[PDB]
Amino acid sequence: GSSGSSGHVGITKRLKTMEVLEGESCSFECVLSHESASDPAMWTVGGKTVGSSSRFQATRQGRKYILVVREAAPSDAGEVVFSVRGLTSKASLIVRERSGPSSG
Numbered sequence: 520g521s522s523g524s525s526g527h528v529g530i531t532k533r534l535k536t537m538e539v540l541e542g543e544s545c546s547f548e549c550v551l552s553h554e555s556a557s558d559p560a561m562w563t564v565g566g567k568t569v570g571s572s573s574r575f576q577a578t579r580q581g582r583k584y585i586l587v588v589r590e591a592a593p594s595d596a597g598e599v600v601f602s603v604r605g606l607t608s609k610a611s612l613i614v615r616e617r618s619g620p621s622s623g
Contacts, residue, residue, distance in 0.1 A: 528553040534601055534610035539591050541616045546587045549601050549608065554582045558604035562586045564612070565595040 532550035539545045547564075562570050562577045564586070569575035574589045584601075591614055599610040 528555065528604075530606055530608055534599060534608045536611045536613070537599075538613040538615075540618070541591065541593055541614050543591050544587065544589055545591060545612075546585050547599065547601075547610070549584045549586075551582055551584075551603065551606075555604055560584055560603040561601070563600045563602065564588060565597050565599065 529552050530549070531552045532548070534547060534549055537545045537547060551560075560577070560579070561568070562575065562584075564575070569586070570577050575586060577584060577586045579585075588595075593614045593616065596612045596614040599612055601608045601610075
């Protein structure tokens with residue numbers, strides 16, 4: 520019949536602000552209108568490339584992505600970005616120095 524598609528794809532769930540305590544683990548969430556399989560996804564936290572790494576394990580679930588961050592530091596805190604097949608997002612990361620008499 521008729522092959523082809525006009526509908527486009529975009530980010531329906533733009534990143535969000537994530538606040539954590541210096542020395543914690545934060546997992547950002549990002550969903551794309553489509554599975555965006557054609558082209559791979561990238562993860563840039565603070566302003567560097569992490570993608571696949573021991574510390575940063577950017578997992579993938581169907582049409583969703585979960586970037587896990589280990590050993591969260593105050594420096595990294597700044598502005599997160601997520602690019603994919605061209606698209607791009609932005610967010611803010613907060614890291615408050617540890618507190619409390621307790622130890623860990």
